[PDB]
Amino acid sequence: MLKSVTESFAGMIHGLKVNHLTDGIIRRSKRMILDSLGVGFLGTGTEVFHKVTQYSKIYSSNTSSTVWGRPDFRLPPTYAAFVNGVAVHSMDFDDTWHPATHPSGAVLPVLTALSEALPPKFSGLDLLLAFNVGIEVQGRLMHFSKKRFHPPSVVGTLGSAAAASKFLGLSLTKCREALAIAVSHAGAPIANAATQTKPLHIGNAAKHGMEATFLAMLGLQGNKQILDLGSGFGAFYANYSPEDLPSLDSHIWLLDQQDVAFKSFPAHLATHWVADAAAAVRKHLVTPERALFPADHIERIVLRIPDVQYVNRPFPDSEHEARHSFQYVACASLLDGSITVPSFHSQQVNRPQVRELLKKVKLEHPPDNPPSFDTLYCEISITLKDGTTFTERSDTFYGHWRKPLSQEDLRNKFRANASKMLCRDTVESLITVVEKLEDLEDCSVLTRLLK
Amino acid sequence: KSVTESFAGMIHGLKVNHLTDGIIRRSKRMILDSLGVGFLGTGTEVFHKVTQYSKIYSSNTSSTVWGRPDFRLPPTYAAFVNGVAVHSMDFDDTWHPATHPSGAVLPVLTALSEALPKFSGLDLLLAFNVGIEVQGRLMHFSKPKRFHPPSVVGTLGSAAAASKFLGLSLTKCREALAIAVSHAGAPIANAATQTKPLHIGNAAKHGMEATFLAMLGLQGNKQILDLGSGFGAFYANYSPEDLPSLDSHIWLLDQQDVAFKSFPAHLATHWVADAAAAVRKHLVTPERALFPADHIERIVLRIPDVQYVNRPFPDSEHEARHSFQYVACASLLDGSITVPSFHSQQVNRPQVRELLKKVKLEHPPDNPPSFDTLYCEISITLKDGTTFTERSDTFYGHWRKPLSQEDLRNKFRANASKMLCRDTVESLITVVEKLEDLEDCSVLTRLLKG
């Protein structure tokens, strides 16, 4: 090895310049940014967001950065990134990568908060760089396994520090300390990822990553081998296998070889397969002449699906539980003919006709279906009361990186998510600003529109 | 299933009724000692760095910053920088199983009292002892360590402490613990660096943050403490256990006192310094008062293999703090080991470096790395062959030979020496020594600023 894994990361963060950007990234990185803002503004209406903003009200006295959807209220950059990151992840509506993590929410709120609170204009190319440095570090730390911690709390916290560290031009040595100090703020046990605290893992990753960067600039030191030791960053890994990063001339961003998956409805990405296969099998059982789902004719529905038992909730009674329910996403798809934001509202999840369809669903876990967003599939077999059986299988859903979302489709998702919180003018301007970020001379024109 | 609820039930159920004069006594010593090394901790470079950062929240003036009336912070970040001060010099409490429990609990409560009827010194004492009890119980759930214990249990100690002090619902005390879990757990590698004090500062802050969020209705996992995918993820072998009935409950602090340090360094070196002083008395006289370093052949220190304290040649103040070798020789040369002994200019003395080169370590098979059992033997062989041997199984300060009150007060008086005038110092001893009878915690918090 040329040097330690830890220094390899400090070198790449400090070294990567604007010229290192690849066209494919500026493209996919712009899709992620508008998506995360859209789901973020939609998240500003959730109870989780209302709770973290109320707490954050004790630091209001510092009015440096914007709080999305709350122009009556400003916060220091650390807690602006905290609550905005929470809103991004508040509904499980944000982007999803491979290996599995949600990397945009932990990075973007940091850079927008930094640009506002900071005084030397900053380029849109500068923002895209720091953002893609945050995305890159998360993906490469992700491959260090060869279960216990929620990856967003782990890789996101460092991804956050990396993004902030390049955005503010820290010395090579100081980007190293920012990574090390962030490691002490990282690692939330994954049991809490199954509760309404899950959004805070992303908000803390953004916040703590920034905090670590501030302390790095003030001279605080961490372990100079934090990424190389099992007693360091590897403590979060069942089995740790770190690897130094390639030279910059031989550097291929992981975002170039692996796009992100974008969600069409706010729920666990595993259910997007269930939704796709449900929409297909549904059109066998309804006609223009018999337009309501023939639930009475049904006897048994089975969802062939990997054993991600976090998503195995056959009788959800809350908005949060239905978001991670193989069963409900299918039943609501079969009955409503669609599955969108309002499908998860309490009023809809406890519909009597939904309850009765949930009684007929059993989960099958075929051995050829591993729990990986890059491999898994959903097969749905519906057996009528008379005996007839219908089966439909979905290997890919519209939104997955194999079948990525259109640009207009992703633009109309954003317009629907920003609908309640911003007027038409602001919505369309943000689209134009984001769609051509590289050409921007001053990040301020974007930050302005966020309020 | 039950373990998480039992914790929430005890936190919520423990009343002033259940406080025993044993823990009230041992608690007031921890409160004074930690206040002491906090005030002294305000002179550390690490404390200056966290304060410089925490000034972005300066706008909120709800809680005091020790040693700096210059500015005030919101309680979350007052407890943060004050906790950092308490562990900034490795001078604070040490319990068994090994952790530093006061630093994660005391800055929490003092900040809360300041930032918001009355709170009696006994309300504070109860909140404090709950925070300490919770830490000890979670420490007893393990059967290669990767996480620094203060950042794991200390964070929950802070949450439980603040949850009691603010009278949280039973269900909310549970959520405050569950939220705190997502804020806990620092890899132990950073415990060997300048960042370690922040583990205690974040334990205090995060525990308070988790308490504030639970108060607003936020919820975590209902069985975070029962699961290996929950709080167990920080343990190599997690074995949780329900907590006893409050009728059958015995405070862990009633059967296990804390060790109090006499000099700012890893507690393991206190055995070495104890033995180093007992052998020194053979090689110096009133007529020959200086240590005859040139007449020594080698210095054998029989000591548990705590490789973090194995630093034969420290060149810094932070490294000498965890050096079997330096503490030993500094005791042999100066005939003492105190706060100034670790200053950079003392560590890099030429004679210190020449004595260090005569030191060799031995790891006896009967010397396990446990503060409750380990010992230090020291054998000095002169150049003429004569060998002097002395052994320290317990040192003055250990829980087996605790510090007297007056010694603990004089340690406090010496630590607050620089930040407070003597009158405030003596006042602080008065108030704390009689905190049970205190009517309002404001009397205590005022004196913490000058």
Side-chain angles (χ1 to χ4, degrees), chain B residues 268-382:
Chain B
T269 69
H270 278 59
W271 282 273
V272 171
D274 202 65
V279 72
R280 179 180 205 266
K281 286 180 173 290
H282 308 339
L283 307 150
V284 306
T285 45
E287 288 74 28
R288 305 297 184 265
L290 293 184
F291 192 74
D294 212 72
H295 286 153
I296 295 204
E297 217 267 357
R298 71 196 133 77
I299 295 149
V300 180
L301 299 158
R302 317 198 160 76
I303 197 70
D305 184 3
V306 198
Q307 177 154 85
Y308 174 65
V309 184
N310 168 14
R311 297 292 176 277
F313 298 101
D315 69 339
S316 62
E317 181 168 349
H318 170 265
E319 197 182 348
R321 215 146 248 165
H322 57 95
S323 168
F324 283 136
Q325 288 86 338
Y326 178 71
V327 166
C329 303
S331 301
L332 297 178
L333 230 56
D334 309 330
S336 69
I337 188 82
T338 47
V339 167
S341 286
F342 299 93
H343 293 175
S344 167
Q345 204 219 7
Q346 305 299 337
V347 170
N348 288 318
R349 277 175 287 165
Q351 307 192 111
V352 156
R353 292 221 54 240
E354 228 62 26
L355 246 182
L356 285 173
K357 294 167 140 165
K358 287 172 181 137
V359 173
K360 289 189 328 195
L361 295 188
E362 280 184 6
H363 302 310
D366 73 335
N367 212 345
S370 162
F371 294 149
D372 191 56
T373 59
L374 80 94
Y375 68 88
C376 171
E377 190 159 26
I378 187 163
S379 274
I380 288 164
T381 310
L382 299 179

Side-chain angles (χ1 to χ4, degrees), chain B residues 17-54 56-117 119-142 144-295:
Chain B
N17 307 10
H18 298 95
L19 292 200
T20 76
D21 284 310
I23 64 173
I24 288 143
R25 186 202 165 266
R26 300 183 163 173
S27 165
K28 278 192 273 180
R29 292 152 54 81
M30 288 144 68
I31 280 167
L32 184 73
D33 192 78
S34 41
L35 279 176
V37 289
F39 293 134
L40 184 63
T42 62
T44 50
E45 180 61 36
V46 69
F47 174 87
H48 169 261
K49 286 169 172 171
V50 297
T51 46
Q52 253 293 317
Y53 155 66
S54 296
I56 65 178
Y57 316 123
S58 163
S59 318
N60 194 254
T61 51
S62 290
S63 295
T64 306
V65 178
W66 298 346
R68 300 230 199 294
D70 318 357
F71 62 126
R72 302 185 103 245
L73 297 165
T76 44
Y77 281 102
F80 168 63
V81 302
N82 289 336
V84 163
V86 168
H87 207 184
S88 65
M89 319 171 90
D90 204 27
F91 209 172
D92 54 317
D93 43 357
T94 308
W95 207 13
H96 195 254
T99 185
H100 310 288
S102 299
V105 180
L106 183 63
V108 170
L109 302 180
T110 61
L112 282 173
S113 309
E114 297 173 310
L116 64 87
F119 285 145
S120 64
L122 211 166
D123 286 332
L124 184 148
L125 275 155
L126 174 57
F128 185 87
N129 277 268
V130 172
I132 306 288
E133 176 78 9
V134 158
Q135 291 180 75
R137 298 292 185 168
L138 303 162
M139 294 279 274
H140 277 109
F141 286 177
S142 40
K145 188 130 221 183
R146 314 155 288 170
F147 292 96
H148 196 217
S151 74
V152 176
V153 311
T155 302
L156 270 51
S158 170
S163 295
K164 169 52 60 174
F165 195 62
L166 307 177
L168 262 52
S169 160
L170 187 154
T171 307
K172 278 181 180 189
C173 291
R174 198 186 63 210
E175 308 300 355
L177 275 37
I179 298 152
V181 164
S182 287
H183 293 73
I188 197 150
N190 275 342
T193 81
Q194 185 174 187
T195 304
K196 192 213 286 185
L198 272 63
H199 293 178
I200 274 292
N202 284 329
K205 172 177 80 127
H206 289 339
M208 190 202 289
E209 293 196 79
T211 296
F212 289 161
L213 291 163
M215 282 164 67
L216 304 172
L218 187 70
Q219 307 182 5
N221 195 283
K222 295 203 163 212
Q223 52 199 20
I224 192 68
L225 302 176
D226 302 75
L227 300 166
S229 69
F231 195 56
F234 304 127
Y235 297 66
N237 178 8
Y238 192 52
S239 177
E241 173 209 336
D242 283 68
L243 290 186
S245 186
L246 289 116
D247 295 3
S248 148
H249 166 237
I250 299 158
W251 296 97
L252 296 170
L253 184 54
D254 264 326
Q255 48 189 187
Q256 175 60 64
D257 192 25
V258 295
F260 282 117
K261 291 173 167 178
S262 303
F263 52 104
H266 196 284
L267 184 117
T269 69
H270 278 59
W271 282 273
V272 171
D274 202 65
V279 72
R280 179 180 205 266
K281 286 180 173 290
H282 308 339
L283 307 150
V284 306
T285 45
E287 288 74 28
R288 305 297 184 265
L290 293 184
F291 192 74
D294 212 72
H295 286 153

Side-chain angles (χ1 to χ4, degrees), chain A residues 378-400:
Chain A
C378 169
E379 192 178 59
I380 312 183
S381 273
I382 301 175
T383 319
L384 303 188
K385 257 163 182 127
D386 76 346
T388 320
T389 302
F390 295 93
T391 305
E392 298 292 311
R393 163 145 163 168
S394 200
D395 307 311
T396 300
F397 65 91
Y398 183 45
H400 194 266

